[PDB]
Amino acid sequence: QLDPITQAYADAISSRPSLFAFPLPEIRDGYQSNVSDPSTEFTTKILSLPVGPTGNVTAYLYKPVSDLLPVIAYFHGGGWVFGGPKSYRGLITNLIRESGAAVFFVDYTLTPKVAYPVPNEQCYAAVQWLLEHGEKLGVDPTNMGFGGDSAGGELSSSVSLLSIKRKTPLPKFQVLIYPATDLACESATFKEFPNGPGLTTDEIRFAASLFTPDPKSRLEDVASPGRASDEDLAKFPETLIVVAEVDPIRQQGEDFGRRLQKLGVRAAIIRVLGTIHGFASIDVLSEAPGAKATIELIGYKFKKALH
Amino acid sequence: QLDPITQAYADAISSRPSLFAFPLPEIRDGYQSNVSTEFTTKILSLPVGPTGNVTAYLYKPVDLLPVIAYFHGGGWVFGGPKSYRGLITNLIRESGAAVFFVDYTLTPKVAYPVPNEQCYAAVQWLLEHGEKLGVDPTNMGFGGDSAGGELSSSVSLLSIKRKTPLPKFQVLIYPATDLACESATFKEFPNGPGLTTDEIRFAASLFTPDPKSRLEDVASPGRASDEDLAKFPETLIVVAEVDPIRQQGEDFGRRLQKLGVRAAIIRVLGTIHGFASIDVLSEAPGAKATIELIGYKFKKALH
């Protein structure tokens, strides 16, 4: 059922207590290994953007070393509670290495210091900012990708939906990695994998309660882009969806994808067998065969779609 | 459930009669239409195998090239360099490797185990003579789709039984791994577009008329021993979702993982059997993405 590398990880993390319980650590971001090895190199610009509902969004612009670079706007996962530039260093260096693109990593504010729709709007505003200021930073905003995993997938598709509603430019290409696309309903696989390793169904309900304390929010399309209208969804950018087989959240990605296919959006949907939620960002899992191959595909696919 | 491009193709050939019926055409290979410049072509007559001859095509793209031994599909009844021109062009472009395309004899002109042994002997020849052809036999991949997947894993299994060099990397695309048993997806997609259970039975009766032949591990490497399978080279298995034989490639993958060989298994949703070589389908998003992945994975694995 699970590949060795993945099964070994799943064992050492039943040892673990749910990190998603009260109280929450003041620190929500950190290096997984601090290996501390490269050998893909990129420059970093730290950005304080005077935008978004809180007045400020922190972003990191990463550019690979050596006319305007393509740029991937990346929205990280971690249940809206955790994650950031440090814990996502592996995935970002992977994307950069394989895609040759710049990465615009939005370090949005974490729950519960804010709640829906503030992180969504922060992400959306960062992207607007990027559209306007990107060229003078050496990236080409007319050549943009969207990428996000889990919560970041929700944010990715949310930002896409908000762009459609506001008639601001969409990205050329979007990748959703086991996205949360419907916070309102429990799909078939919530049942199928109540504890099924790597992501518990109680860790899901909990993050939803911090992100969307008003359950009525979850029915809104900006919150749950899976519940968007046919008419809006039909305008989504070409989208690649990648899901883990053993994942409470698997059905959302697949449903969302089928929905796009039905509406005539170019949408590729790929399920990776023998792997668990988090395979794209957790360092250990990312070296398993299926994970490693699809991480490469994601990066390669940005490279081809973004020019 | 199927993406628009795939569904449109399915509607189109919904009327068209199955090729897997008598009379079989005299000509079993042909261009999907219509007529390289990205690679050279060398036709090889190999004085090997049970028939005395195995035809192979060495394709080289623009020090020693890596080389992919490719075993084409077509239910053992059809196929060759012409019908597979698209996939091969893709593989060469995406991978940067030479492709060593084994044009094994089709059925029922021959039958099991002759194609298997032809493919096996072709690889032994390549191992000996590759460097002289400008490729590196120590930097070798296997790929095959469907029947070609059966053939690929069969050559892998024979290499293990006979102690001859395995490849660095292997790609099986909706492979046939178990000719003896009917899987869950046989029932789930008995008629489902792209490949029917009727067609599977047809090809099986020509390739392996004796049911007992289907139980041999060389015919069905999915039934090999745990001891042998555990020595398989790192494998990537890609399957289509709506396909009677989907179940075979996944079961084979799980067994590889269970036995500790590096095995990646990927299911592509909304697409059918044949998406990797059928020119129309190749442009659908899922299909396009996985053909690229396959070519890319050969690039990464072969140096």
Residue numbers in the entry:
A (entry chain A): 34 to 99, 107 to 347
B (entry chain C): 34 to 68, 72 to 98, 107 to 347
Reported in the publication:
We present here the results of a detailed functional characterization and 3D structure analysis of these three T. melanosporum enzymes, designated as TmelEST 1, 2 and 3, which are shown to be non-lypolitic HSL carboxylesterases closely resembling archaeal and endosymbiotic soil bacteria esterases. The 3D structure of TmelEST2 shows an α/β-hydrolase-fold with well discernible cap and catalytic domains. The latter contains the core region with the catalytic Ser-His-Asp triad, while the less conserved and more dynamic cap domain controls access to the active site and thus likely determines substrate selectivity. The active site of TmelEST2 comprises the Ser190 nucleophile located within the conserved Gly-X-Ser-X-Gly motif, the proton carrier His317 (β7) and the other charge-relay network residue Asp287 (β8).
